Amino acid sequence: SNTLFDDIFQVSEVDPGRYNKVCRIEAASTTQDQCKLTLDINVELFPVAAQDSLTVTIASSLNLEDTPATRSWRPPQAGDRSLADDYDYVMYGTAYKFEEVSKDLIAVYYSFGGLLMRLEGNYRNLNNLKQENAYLLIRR
Amino acid sequence: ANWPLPVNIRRIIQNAQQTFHIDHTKPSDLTIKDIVLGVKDLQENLLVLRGKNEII
Amino acid sequence: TLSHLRRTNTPIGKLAKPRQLHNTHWGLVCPAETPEGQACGLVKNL
Amino acid sequence: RGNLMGKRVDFSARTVISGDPNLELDQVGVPKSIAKTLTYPEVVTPYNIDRLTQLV
Amino acid sequence: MIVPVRCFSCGKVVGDKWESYLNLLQEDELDEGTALSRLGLKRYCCRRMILTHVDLIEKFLRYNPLEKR
Amino acid sequence: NASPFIKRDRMRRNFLRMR
Amino acid sequence: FIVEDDESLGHKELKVRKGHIAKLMATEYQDIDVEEYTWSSLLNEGLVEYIDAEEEESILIAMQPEDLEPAEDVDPAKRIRVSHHATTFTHCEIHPSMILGVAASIIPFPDHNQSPRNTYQSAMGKQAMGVFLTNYNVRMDTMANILYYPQKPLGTTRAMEYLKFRELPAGQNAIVAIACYSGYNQEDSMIMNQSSIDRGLFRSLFFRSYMDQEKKYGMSITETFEKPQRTNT
Amino acid sequence: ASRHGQKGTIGITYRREDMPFTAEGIVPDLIINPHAIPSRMTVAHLIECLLSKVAALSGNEGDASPFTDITVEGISKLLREHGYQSRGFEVMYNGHTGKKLMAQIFFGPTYYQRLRHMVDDKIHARARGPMQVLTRQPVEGRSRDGG
Amino acid sequence: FEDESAPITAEDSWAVISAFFREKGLVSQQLD
Amino acid sequence: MNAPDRFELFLLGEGESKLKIDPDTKAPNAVVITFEKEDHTLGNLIRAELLNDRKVLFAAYKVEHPFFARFKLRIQTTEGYDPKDALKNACNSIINKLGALKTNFETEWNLQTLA
Amino acid sequence: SEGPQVKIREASKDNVDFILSNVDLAMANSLRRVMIAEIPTLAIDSVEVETNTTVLADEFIAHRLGLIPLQSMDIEQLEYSRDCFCEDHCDKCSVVLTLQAFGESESTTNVYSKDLVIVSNLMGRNIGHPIIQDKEGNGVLICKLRKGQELKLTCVAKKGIAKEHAKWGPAAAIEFEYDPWNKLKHTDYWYEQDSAKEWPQSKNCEYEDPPNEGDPFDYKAQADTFYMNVESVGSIPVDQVVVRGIDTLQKKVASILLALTQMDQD
Amino acid sequence: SLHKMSMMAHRVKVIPYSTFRLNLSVTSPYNADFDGDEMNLHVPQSEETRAELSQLCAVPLQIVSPQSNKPCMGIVQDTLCGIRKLTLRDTFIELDQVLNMLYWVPDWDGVIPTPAIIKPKPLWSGKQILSVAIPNGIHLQRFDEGTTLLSPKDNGMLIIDGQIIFGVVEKKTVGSSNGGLIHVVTREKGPQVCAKLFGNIQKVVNFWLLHNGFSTGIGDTIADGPTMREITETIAEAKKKVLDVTKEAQANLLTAKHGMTLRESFEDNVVRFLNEARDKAGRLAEVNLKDLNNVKQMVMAGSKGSFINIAQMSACVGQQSVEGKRIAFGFVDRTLPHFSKDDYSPESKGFVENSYLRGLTPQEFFFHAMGGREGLIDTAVKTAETGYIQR
Ligand SMILES: [Mg+2]
Ligand SMILES: [Zn+2]
Ligand SMILES: [Zn+2]
Fold this sequence. Notes:
part of a larger assembly; 12 chains; A: 1 helix; 3% helix; 50% strand; binds magnesium ion
């Protein structure tokens, strides 16, 4: 429901790789000097250039109400209000790895259908993330 | 190191980790004596021959 | 019918290698026209 | 070798094989004429008296 | 052995264009491509029907009829 | 690039035009 | 071909010239009034020669006349070909494509194939369906398969012009897509158009002839061609 | 079979409205699998199809003799002059839905031969039948209702 | 063409081949 | 020899109905409708029109085997909306769109004078 | 009116080239498939041979006769033979043609489809006539006779659709295109060096604006504005192919509605 | 029928055509093609034989072969190519096609998975939809070269609770290989679930490849101009090395390797140079090939073809060998009457510098014909002798 993580990242570099629709961006946080993100982005739906300021948010659910996927996805109805309305690019995925980079730095790995991100930083801001499913909401 | 052996221990370990949701942060309920004795009695339970003499 | 009328046969108990396509077969028998079976190389076509 | 170790048998069929992605792994697509030729002798039971009567 | 009635791929009737195809070649002195395009065969599926046809009925008609009335 | 066509009717016509 | 000294040009050249070629084409188009110039005319004038495998050991043969005979930018699409760097030829190949037999001469671009595939096609060309003879209606062969609509190939070899393949073809030009369409063409299967089949694609005639004779074993043991009746037979 | 050792049986028959179609409405008479190409290294099948496409479009029968100076690039230039993609690919559409296939399909005429192996001359079954006089086992041969 | 003694090309030799099959045929060895 | 008759592609046999609606136990308010003697021509049209219905959560069709002219259409709608009514609405909208297309084509053809 | 829009680009006797706009991909493809396979048409279905001294087989001639395009303008007035109460065929469900050809000339006598003579009572309908397209006035070349050869036969033509047999198909080749600029990205263009240079532009690219090559990909855009070209075999006019295809698709959907109501009432 | 998996028990489905129909995955244990292959059926006539036929000889029970303790049935051919193309990172599926895929899985539970992309368009990845066919509780982990928990090349494999995390699904995952998905599913879930997995994967991948398409053509065998120039330079420098070794041998300056004569050492050096030339030219051609190359896609999927096929079709056929050596002097001191005497050049003794695309010269054609004839003879002899050995 609520925001597990939210930060503003500046895109250091964008690597297209051998793909035509997916580019792997590497970005660093502006507020924190040692939290950074590596993330696969469908760039036809959401074009990302270098030195772009992206607000990146992780949530456990999209609805504005608190939590009480096992529920079947349905197309969004007219008048449906969610957190996705406040952002430009929403992905859904699974946390599949929690590693400790150092004595303080941990890295969380998420898989949105095969689009991977690694988000690392120490635990006073990444402790909300646990082994569950999460939404990644990105706005420019 | 890699040799053909019957029971894939690694798959059973992963199935136990994902079945009981091992968070690898909470301390374990296992005592060490229980682990050692359990491994030992498991070794005594791996029966291929059921004879009750010294040769078998 | 045309291939059957230009077909040759080599009867095979020697120590040679009559099944392989020889160098001297250039322009005299077809380099690739032979049965896939036990008659491979022994049955040749001009 | 030709009559005891191996032999020609009844209740057998042979035709060309073709691929079918819509069949199961353990399914064979049997031609209807081959199905009408090959038979299975089913013993009449109370559980299949009606179905075997309909087949007759 | 005789010209097919319809194109195999698409079904265009090409059997009525065979006798006019021969006239475009022998007395109009056209090459085969212009003769095919003149008859309206613009798809190569139709062009191969007339262009590659062999008129074996002409060889079959040289034999005397077995039942002659 | 050589022409990849067996065009023997037109060469027969040309040779008869020489004759 | 015969390669002579040819001191007029200062280098080795084929004895056959454009005049002999013109005479051969004049005779050929007469066959379809000047002097008849045939293959034996080429043989008797020393333009061509018969060489067996024993005599082939003592000669040097050029593959092509216009490449290996005269003394020496290139297209990258063309195949790499050497000129052998030697001018002492005694003979020239009439055409290298005549190393192939009857069945292999049907194959289009056999030099662009793997050789086992050429062998497999030379085997399976005898199993095809066409018009084996134009008098099949008056022949009572045991088995005969005749295509309804034979077509000459769009891609054809020069050699099959002498094999009468454009006159008695053994196949059809099918519009072929190379595609993984439905999964029903996997492992050498193919998806045929049913609508094309309905219009006569690869539809064939099949003839089977049954022979029967009435033989006289003796006086009373003789056979008779008759319609039998259930009462007395 | 094609003229290149590419033999095979009919897996299924589709009607015209189910076959894939080009933008010109041309449907194949035959669909063969791509996986028959690379392991068998049958390049001449592809060149024959390309040359036959150019031959049908131009009306001149293709010269497919072995040791001539006919390259793939010349056939490709001639095919591009006719308004088609030079390597024989065509934008094809799915016949079931009308949507364009994401991959373009190699497309063109190819000479195919009907071999004498029919399924109807080879399909065989026997529940019970005549036995041999000697061994009293099932007889041999489908023409004798054999085993 | 215009020159009677000009050297032939690879195309011209097919004419020679035609002459061969205008005299021998494909079953010349059996008949001979 | 084993070839089926071609009219079995479009003719209902003895004891066979055009539609056969079964409830689906996998998801609530979902049905599976078996269309006999039809193919992708009807199935794709019906499915793509059902996906334009706003109260339809799921619409899919499949031809389980190309040998048999039949397809299964699974429809799952929202609560309180009968999937049979969704099928009726999709069919009615297809009918109306096809009628408009027929009238438009007839008028545009009558505008043509070069035929 | 509101709904699918039609703009006819070209019209001929046997070709109509039109732009079908404001319509989904499924309905355009369903119309294409129905025109190909579902329009009822008259074609020769059974051949009864009396005399055949030609060089062609009886079954060869019968297969050629099935593919002869016959006039089918009033085919809806004709009945399916399976739905008719006659024993084999009659004027209500069939058209009976005859073909009598004799080689009385020294040269080869060509047997055309103009030699087919209707001997059944048409009841004033507009069916059964073989379609003549060429300027010579002859029809499809059916057979060839040398001197003394005879071909006497009787055809019964029954209505049917191309799903049963392709001889009943009036639709020839149907050109069907959409999005010539690949703005929906429904094709990933194979290329060697440049996809725009190596792939020739279609003729329909003039009817749509080219992409601006800086604009983002339009993920909300759907497939509409289909460029269709229907070609007629000749059995029905080329406009009647489209109209009868729309009618047949409408009748299929209405039959589904009718079956749904019939099992709703139970 | 060399082995026990070549005779297995199936279930009848009566079909209206004249051929036996069977799944594509079961053709590998049967060693069966569809170029005219025929297979025998046998009908048990009693309940005991019917029962022990389905409890011992059933196809799911023979998925893992005791011959090599690995699965003998796997995803093959079009399904393998389409399962590699489906599980690329670029492969995103729109809602209508996703629903059609989900309905094609027979044991799908009826819940639509949440898309990998929610906004601005609901898009499902191919891994996400293929994970529906994979049963829950299946965990697989394989690391290829350069594979980390982030996969920049999307190689390796990670499946957690039956959901694909990363990795393109290829022959290493759904092929007949040990430690693959087939092996893990049939050891953890049983043979019936593995047979259902075969069916589900085949259905969903075949539907996607039907509505996606896959082809191959002549243009897939063509490397561009700079690569062809580099290949020609590689072949030319190898011919220069062969000429240098030939000059050293003809000047008797070449030393003999131990255990072999001067001519044997010369032949070994020449064959080594020509083989490494063919390998280098093929590697250049393979590197030049794009990811959209269809032969490259089939090789990457492992469905058909290999590196040597790409090398021979595009770069260079290479040295032809008869009885393990170069083309022998079948004439007196020469291989063909078009060469001079004592010619040990690569073109004289059977090196085919041209690819199948460029076409073989007549001498190269004849030498390749000798190589193919030797291959066919060896194939027939090997089959007969191995049948003898097996009996
Ligand atoms: Mg086989
Ligand atoms: Zn056509
Ligand atoms: Zn009636």
